[model samples]
Target: SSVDQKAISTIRLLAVDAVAAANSGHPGAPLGLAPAAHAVFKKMRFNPKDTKWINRDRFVLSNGHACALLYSMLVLYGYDLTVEDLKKFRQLGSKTPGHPENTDVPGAEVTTGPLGQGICNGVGIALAQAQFAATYNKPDFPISDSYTYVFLGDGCLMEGVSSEASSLAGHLQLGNLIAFWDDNKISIDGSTEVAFTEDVIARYKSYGWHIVEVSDADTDITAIAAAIDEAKKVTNKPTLVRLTTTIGFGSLAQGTHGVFGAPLKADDIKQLKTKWGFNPEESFAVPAEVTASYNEHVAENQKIQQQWNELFAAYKQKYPELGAELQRRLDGKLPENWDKALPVYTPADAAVATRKLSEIVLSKIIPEVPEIIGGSADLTPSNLTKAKGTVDFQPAATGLGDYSGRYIRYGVREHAMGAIMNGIAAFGANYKNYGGTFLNFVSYAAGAVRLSALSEFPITWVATHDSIGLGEDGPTHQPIETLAHFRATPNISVWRPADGNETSAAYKSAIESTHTPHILALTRQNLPQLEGSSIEKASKGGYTLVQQDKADIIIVATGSEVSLAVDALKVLEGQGIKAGVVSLPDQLTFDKQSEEYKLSVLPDGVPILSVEVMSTFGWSKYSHQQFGLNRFGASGKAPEIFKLFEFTPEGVAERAAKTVAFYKGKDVVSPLRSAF
Candidate 1:
C-alpha cells in the first residue's frame, strides 16, 4: 500500500511552520524523521482510538526536542490535535508546550523535555510490557502481547541516564522493545562527534542488545518493517536499529549542523521545497498524496486491530480469565483487592526494620498486584525490595530468567531508575509499577523526579537509607538535601515513615492517592512505633503523636528523628514543660490539613522545635525553631554520625528546653512575640 506522502508532507510542512512561527524549537529531526514517522505509524499495530488499549504497540519519541515531528504524527493519526494548534506550537498552555507532554496533549503518553528521559521512560514501558506478560500470560494466551517502539536522536542515547537504562533494559531482555536511533550526527552543541565518539551500535551490542543498522532510513518502509520483524525475533534481547538519518532532511540547509535547531529562512524553505519536489507556494501544505500515503499505515493498523479483536474474542472464550485480566490491565485497572494483600503489622510484629517492613509489604503485595514491578539498584537485600519467587529479567537465557520476572536489577543506576520508572508508568495501562534505590541516590535521579511530579504519575520510588541513620553505609549513603529537594518538587509526596505502622500507612496512602506519585522513604535501622501512627493520620501527612490538656511547647519530627523528639518530650514534661509531639511524616500532606486542625496539632503561642536530622529548609514553615543537621553527615556508624551531628535525645531535649526557656522569659503578648 502506498503511504500518503500528502499527509507525511503536511507533517513536515507543519513542523517547518511551527518552529518558524514560534521563532524557536528544533525543526530538523521532524523534517528528517517524517518518512520514518510515516512508516512507523503506518506499519505498527497501534491505534490512536485505543491509545490505552492493551496489546497495542507503543510509540515514543525519545528525542522530545523533535516534538514538532511527533505532534504532526499524532495530529495526522487522528488524535484530537488540529492544524491550527500546530501553528501555535510554543504558545502558553497550548497542547504543544514547546515539548510534547502527555499530560498536556491528549494522546501524549509521558512528558519529555529532559534529555534521555524519553528513551529511559520507553525502557520502563517495555519492562511494564514484560511484567504484564509474566503475570497474565498463560501458555496459549498472549494477552500481554505488545512492543514498545522508540525513536530517539543521538542526544537521547548519548545521555548517561539513557546508557544506564539501556544497559538495564538489555539485561532484562525486553525483546518487545525496538528502538530507532536517529544517527543524525548533530546536536544543539553542534556535531555529536565533538563529545560522543563511541559507536552506539557497539555500545548497545555490549549491553546485550540485538543491534541492527539501517543506512537508508527516509525512503525504506519495507526495510524498516523487516528490521522490526528481526527485532521481534530476538525476544531474548532488546533491539536497537541505528538508522543513519540526515538531520533537517530535504532543506537547503540539509546535512549542515547550522539548521538542526534553527528554522529555515523563507527563501531557504522555498529553495528546499523545490529540491524535494514539494510546492513552495503554500505554507503548512499537505499535498493530496502525503496524507493518502500515510493512511495506508492507518488502514493496515486498523485491519490488524480488527483481526486481533476477533482473535481476542475467540481467545476470551478459550481463556476467559486471562482475556479479562488483560482488558483490566489495559484499562489501567487494578485487580480487585490488590491492596488486600498489602501486609499490615501489629506492634508485636518482632520489631522489624522499616526497610524490612517494606520488603514484607512488597513480597505480599506483588503476587496480588501483578502489575507491580521493579527492583533496587544493587540494594535489593538492603532496600528489602526484591519480591520473592519472581525471576530476574536478563538478556541471555540464564534459564533462571523469563520475561515475566517482576524484578529488574537496575545495576547502580539511580538517575536511570527514576527516569525508567516514568517510562514504566507511561507504558500504556496494564502495568502498575514501582522501582527502588537508596534515598541518597535519588539525588542522581533528581531531574527525572522533577518530571515525575510534573506528570503526576503513580511512579513509586522505594527510597531506603533515608537519613543519616542509614548506619555503616556512611556519609555517602546518608541523605541531607534529598528530603528538602523532593519536598520542593510540586505534587510529589515524600513519605519518611518512622516505623512499621507508618510504613504500612505510607504504602496505603501511595496507592490510594492516584492523582500523584510518592517516594517511600524508609529507615535502615529499627524504629520504635509511635502510639498515634495510623493509616488515617499518616495519610493526613502529620498527626499529633502526643497531646496534653494544654501545652506551652510543641516538638515536631519526622522519620528516625521523631523517636528522639518523643523521648525528649518525656524529659520536657519531667521539667514541668507541657510539650506536645507532632509526627510529620510527609510535610506536603501536613500542609493540606485545615488551619484549625494544624493549629490544634502545633498551636501558636507555644514555642515549637522541629527535630529532623537533615536540612532544616522546610521545617521553618511548621516550627518556630528547627533542630536539624546544619551540615553534611559524616562517614561513620549511624550512631556515631548521629552523635557527630548532635542527634541525641539530650541534644534534642536541650534544644526544646532552650526554646521553652526563651518563650517563658518573653512577655506572652509583646509585639516581639510576633517574630517568635
Candidate 2:
C-alpha cells in the first residue's frame, strides 16, 4: 500500500531529522528498522487517547537509543506527541530524552536504557497478563488477553541478564510475548562479530522460543506483519522474530560503521529524501497521506479498546464479584478490614526469628489481600515466602501449578526476579508483588533494584538470613555491608524489624509506600519481643522501646540487635549508668519523621550509641557513637558468633559507658538534630 510505504519512509526521515538536530543518537537502527516499526505499529492494539487501556498491547524499545524512531511513531499515531517534541529529542527536560523513560512519554511502557532490562520487563508484563487472564477469564469473557511486543538489538541479547529472563520466559511458556531483533550487525564498536558471534537464532531456539527469520526489514512490510501474526498464533512458546537489514538503509553511509552511531550528512539525507519524493530541503516534514494513514490506524486501535470496554461491561454483569474485585485491584485499594487480621504481640510472646514472623504475616495478609503475589528465588523454604494454600504459578502441564496460582517458584534467578518484579509493578499499582532471596544475594540483582528505585517501582524485596546471625551458613551466606548498601539507595526503605509487631508494621508501611520499593531484612535467629513495640509506634520508623527520664545515654538499634540493647540496659543500670532504648527499623522513614517526634525518640542532652550486627556505614546520622561489626563474621554458633563479635549485653554496655565518659562534659544533642 502507498500508505504503508509512505509511513515507513516518514518514520525513517523523521528519525534521521531528529537525530541530526540533536547532533547525537544512534540513527542507524531506526532507519534500518523503519519498516518493522511501521509493520508492528500498524497491527498494535493501542489507543492514542488511552495509553493505559488495560487490553492495549505493550511496546518496549529495549534498544532505547533508537528513541527518535519511537517519538516519530507516537506523533504519527496521533498520541499526544508532536513534531516539536521530536525537535527537542536528546535535550534535557524533553519528553524525548536520550532514552525512552516510561514516565517521560505517554506510550513509553517501561524505562529501558540499560541493555537487556527492557526485554526482561516485557517478559514480566506478558507473565502478568497471562496470570490475570488465567485467573479472571471465564470460558469466553477474557478480561486480559493483551500481548507484549519488544524491540531489541544485538547489544541487548549479549547481556547475561537477558539470558536469565529469557530462559525463565521460555520455561513458563509465555506465548503472549513477541520480540523483534534488529540484526543490523553494527554496534558502537562496529560489527557484533568481533564480540557477539554466537548463533543467535539457535540460541533463542534452545531457550524454547518460536523463531521467525525475515530476509529483509528494509521494505518487507508483509513479511514482518506475517511473522507477528504467526507469533500470535503460537500458544505454547514465546516468539523471537529476527529481521536482517543494513544500518542507515537509505543513506550514502549505509554500509559503513560511521552511520551506526552518528547522523547522516546533509547531502546524504537530501538524496534519501529525494528517493522518497519528499522535499530535500525540509527538515521535519510530514506528508499528508502518511498522517491520514496513521490517523486511520489510531481510529482502528480505539475501536479495539471500545470493544474491550463493552466486553468488560458484559463481564461485570455476568460475574459481579470477580468484576468488583478486578476493579478494586485496579484501584489499588486493600480490603476494608485488611489490617484487622494483623497479629499483635506483647513482651510475653515467645522469641521467634523475624523470617518466621514474615511468614506469618504473609500467610495472614495473603488471604485478605487477593492482589498479593509471593515468590522466592528458589529459596522458598529458607526464605519462608510461601503462604498457606497458595499454588505455584507455572504451567499445569508440568504439574507444578496453573497460571492462576498466587505463588511463583522463580527458580534460582535473582537478577531476573528483580527485573521481573519491576515489570509486574509497572503492570498496575494495585498488585502487591514481592520476591525473596538471601540478603547476601540481593547484590546479584542490584542492577534491577536500582531501576526499581529509579523508576519508583513499589515492589518488595524479602531479604532473609540478614546477618552473621545466620550462624552455621557462614559468611558466604551472611550479609555484612548489604544493609548499608541498600540504605544508601534513594527512595528505598530498608527495614530491619525487631519483633512480630514490628514485622507486621514493616509490611504495612512497605505496602503503603506507593512510589517506593522496600528491602525487608529479617533475622535467622529468634528475637525476643520488646515491651513498648507496637504497630502504631514502629510504623513511625523508629520509637522508644524502653524510654527513660533524663537517662545518662540513649541506645539506638534495629532488628535482633535491639534486643541486645534492651539486655544492655540492665547491665548499665547495675553500674548506675541509666540508659534508654530506641528501635530504629527503617532509617529512611525515620529521617522523614517530624522533628518534634524525632527529638522525643532521641532527645537532646543525651549521648547516643547505635548497635547492629552489620557494617555501621549510615549509623552516624542517628548516633554519636556506633557499635557494630567492622569486619567479616566468623563461622560459628549464633551465640558464639555474637560473643566473638562483641555483641553481648556486657560488650554493648561497655561501649555505652565509654561513649558517656568521652562526651561527659559536653552538651549532647540528637545526631539527627538538624537546623533545616
Candidate 3:
C-alpha cells in the first residue's frame, strides 16, 4: 500500500517535472489522474517490449492535454520511452509532444490531442476487438479478448463526438470498454461549474452504460482498482468510472484554474515534492521501488504474452485455416491477389453512378477480403455502402445481427464514425475500415479526419453525393470546398472517381493503403465508362483518357466532370480543335507517380483546362485555367444545376476555346513546374 502511494507520487512528480522542464503543457490533470493511471497500468495486460500484442488492453487519454501522465506511465513501465524522453516533453522532435501521437509515442494506442476523439477511438478499438474475437476465437481459445480503457475530462464529455460514440458503445454493448472520467472541476477557463453542470452518471445510465463512481480517487488506488474490477464484470454494458478528484492534487494551487494548463511555479513544485515524500531538489525522479514494482508488472505481462503465443500455436494446430488467416493479418499482408476481386468495366457497359460502382466493388471484394468492415452514417441506402446479403454488426441480443457481422450501422453520427474508424485502424491486424456519408457531411467530422491524416491511419470515407450532382439536396448538401479542403491536408488521398474502373481503383488504393487515409468522393449521378479508362490505368492516380499527339489543348477532370471533359473534347473537335482528356482520379496518388509518368499525363506542349463541379482552388496545380462551381448550388435537377453553373459540354467547350485563345502563342509551360 505504501509502495502504491509512492508509485503514484513518482508518476505525479515525473509529469510535473517534465512540464516544468519544457516550461509548457498542462500539468493539473496529470497530477489528479496519476493514481488512476498507476492503478490502470498495473492492471493492464501489455508487454511494453511488444506494443502490437493483439490481446493487450488499450489505454486512450481522451483529454490528451494530460498526456504528461501518459508519458510518465510509459516511461516508468519500461516502455521504449525513458526519463530522457520525458524531459524533452513538448520540445521539437521529442517523442512526447504536447499531445499523444500514436505515430511517435510508444504504446500510444491512437493519436489523441483533440478532446473527445480518443474516447471515440477507444470505442472503435473495443468494437474491433469484439469483432476480431467473434471472428477468430474458438471455445477456450480467446484470440482478442482485450479491453479498451479511456481517461477523459469535462472537456471530452462536453464534446459532441464523445456523446455520439458513447451512445453507440452502449447500444453495441461493448463491455470491454472502460472509461474513467477525471472529475476535476477546474478547466482552462476557471471552474467547469461556469459552463458544464450536467449529471454525467445519469446520462451514461440513460445511454445504457454501467457506472462506477470513485468518490476519493485522488488518494484511493484501492477504490480505483475496485472500479476497474467492477467494470470488467459488467459483461453486457460498457462502464464509465467517474473519478472524483481535486485538480492539481498536491500543488499549492490545487483546485484552481491557475494550475490547470500552465506549468506550476517553482515553489509549487517544491511544495509538491516535499508533501509527496519526493526529493524537492531532484527532477524527473523515478524511485527504485516504483521502477521495481512496475517492472514486476511488466514481467508478469510478458509471461502472459508468452502464454498467449503458446495458446496461439495450439489454436493453429486445432484450426489451421483460421490460424493462417490470423497470422496473415498479423503479418500486415492482405489476402493474396485480393485486388483480383476489384470489378472492372469496359466502354460497352451501361453508364453507372460511381456510388453504385463503389457498392458493386464492395459486393465483390468484401467476401474475398475478411478485414473489410464498414458502415454508413445513416446514409447507407443513399451512399450505397452496404453490399447485398451481408449481416449488420449488431449484438445478438438485438436479433438484428451478430458480433461477427462485417457491416456496421454507424447511425447518423458522422464525427463519431470518423473517429471510430480511426480507432479501428489503430487496432491493427491489417484492418481496412471505411465509413460512408454525404460528401458535405464529412466536413462535420473535420477534427477527426484531420487526425486521421496526422495519425496516418488507413481509414476510408465513402463520401457520395460529391457535388451539385446530388441536385435536390440544395446548397446545404453540396460540397463546394470539400475536396479542396481535404486535398490540401497532408496525407489524405482524395479520390474523385469518374466511372466503374476508377471506382474500383479508388477502393484498390484505399484497401492497399498502409499509411494514408482515403476519401472516395463518388458521384450521385451516372458517369459513362470511358473508352480508355481501366483499373490498371487509373491505378496510377491519373492517366491519359484520350491521347491527341497534336492536340491543341488538354482537359483534366475527375468524378462526374471527367465525362463532361470527354464530351467537351468532342465539342471542341466539332469546332476544329483537337483536345486530349486526362482523368485525374486521385491527385495525391497521381502526385506520387514518377515525374515521367505524370508528365506523360499532363505534358509541356499544350495548355491544360481543369474541370470539376466544386471549388477550383487546387486545380491550379494541374491546369492553366479552371472551370468549377465556386458558388453554392440551387435545389433543382442535377443537369439544370450543371447548366446553371456553365458546366455543360458546350459551356466547357466555350471555356476551353477561350482558354486556347488566351494561351495562343504564349509559350506556356506545364503547371507542374514550380519555382521551388
Over 4 Å off in model 3, which ranges?
380-382
What is the per-residue lDDT of model 2 for residues 116-157, given as tens digits with 9 covering 90 to 100? Answer: 899988988888888888878997897888889999988889
Ranking by lDDT: 3, 2, 1
Per-residue CA lDDT of candidate 1, range 1-676, in tens?
4335555556777898888888888888987788778767766676776676667788888888899998888777767787788888999878877888877886777888788888888888888777766666666666668888898887787689989988888877778888899988887778987997887788888999998787887666567777888888887888998778888787778878877778788887787666656788766665656655555667778787888778777777888877776667666677887766766655555666677788888888777776677777747565554577777764336775666677777888988888888887777454456777788888888878889889878778888888877777677778888888889879998988877778877887676555578898887888776667776677778888888658777788888888888888787778877778888888777778787677677665677788888888877788878888767677667788788767887788788888878877664331112343
Ten-residue region with minimum lDDT total, candidate 2:
378-387
Candidate 2: give the clashing pairs: none
- Candidate 3 C-alpha lDDT tens digits along 172-244: 9999999999899866667888988888899999999999999999888899999999999999899999999
Query: TM-score per candidate, in order?
Result: 0.93, 0.97, 0.99
Root-mean-square deviation of candidate 3: 0.9
Model 3 residue pairs with clashes = none
- Compare candidates 1 and 2 on lDDT and give the better one: 2
Better candidate by TM-score, 1 or 3: 3
Candidate 1 segments exceeding 4 Å error? 1-7, 277-279, 293-296, 306-316, 337-340, 345-350, 380-382, 394-396, 664-676
Residues forming the 10-long window of minimal summed lDDT in candidate 1: 667-676
RMSD of 2: 1.7
